[model samples]
Target: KVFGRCELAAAMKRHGLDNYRGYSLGNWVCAAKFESNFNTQATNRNTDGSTDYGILQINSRWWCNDGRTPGSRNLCNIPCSALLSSDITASVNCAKKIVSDGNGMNAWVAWRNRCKGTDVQAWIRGCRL
Candidate 1:
């Protein structure tokens, strides 16, 4: 729901995601672009029967509750709908846990597939922090 990349970067920085969970802000921005295009309400149904939620596309299988799902690890302890809001705190906090539990940004398939080893300067280009 952010207007553009600069706004996105500013929000991320304000939320302390500029250098969160041992990953750079560029990495976070790049991943967000590919995962959900920075759309807060984005959701995707995976072939594995799991669902991705919010800007980060966090999975319902391990992270958030889908309400109808009977057995989710629900490590984030928040409903998947919480991720779909303009407020990104729940999503960011859950992302922190994911990065801590896994290989930093590599926990996101989008990051591994699109952002790894790439020059990510453009992800924050023209954004004054």
Candidate 2:
């Protein structure tokens, strides 16, 4: 499903991405916008042939266990398919571990390029979450 801006924001906020690993909810909001444009089933393939899954785009290379990413680590211990749904509970939980494991929010290059150090208020502005 393609979520409206506030719809995605509130859903993510409900899943507790707010202030996780010292990043604010707006950061996550920005990420979801840039990464997936609020599409729950969004997926992308990397140059290495690994795929990024779900709204957060959890990578198959180092995150989820997609059989496609040969020899990749399944740090989240969940199948990549789990991330590709309107229900973000699994995606959000896997994302928490992704941040704590390494590099903080830089785990997403999109965040570094588009969201880091920027005033993210507009990302969640007027959202009634």
Candidate 3:
């Protein structure tokens, strides 16, 4: 688990994700909160037989690989397990690719379902640089 929301924000900022590629830091932080509650080891199985990994909850269907799971596009070419690690470098890089692919944060269900059209500044409120 992360130390706190502040820690997560700080890490994302360090990785140059704060407002990276036109996405706001608030949306990114809000997505992380709803996706994994800032837990790196978080994993959730989807109804379509895919699993979401890490803080961003990236899907195996098109982003990462789940061992023994078939038909993964694996565009990121990183193992889903890599996303589960406390170090978020792999996850952040992959997420950038997803956003660059024209989906923006909409690639994440959490962003679409929970963060969209909402005031998400609280997710990063009081977080230090």
| Reference-based TM-score, model 1 | 0.94
Whole-model lDDT, model 1? 0.86
Off by over 4 Å in 3: none
lDDT, each prediction? 0.86, 0.90, 0.87
lDDT of 1 by residue, 1-129 (tens): 743677888888888887776677898889999999989989999887889999999999899999755677899999899999898888888988898885778889989999989998789988888
Model 3 C-alpha lDDT per residue in residues 53-84, reported as the tens digit of each score: 99888899999988756887999998899999
lDDT of 3: 0.87
Question: Could you give candidate 2's per-residue lDDT for residues 13-102 as a string of tens digits?
Answer: 898888998888999989888899888899999999999999889999998998878889999999999999778999999999999987
Candidate of highest TM-score = 2
Which model is ahead, 2 or 3, in terms of TM-score? 2
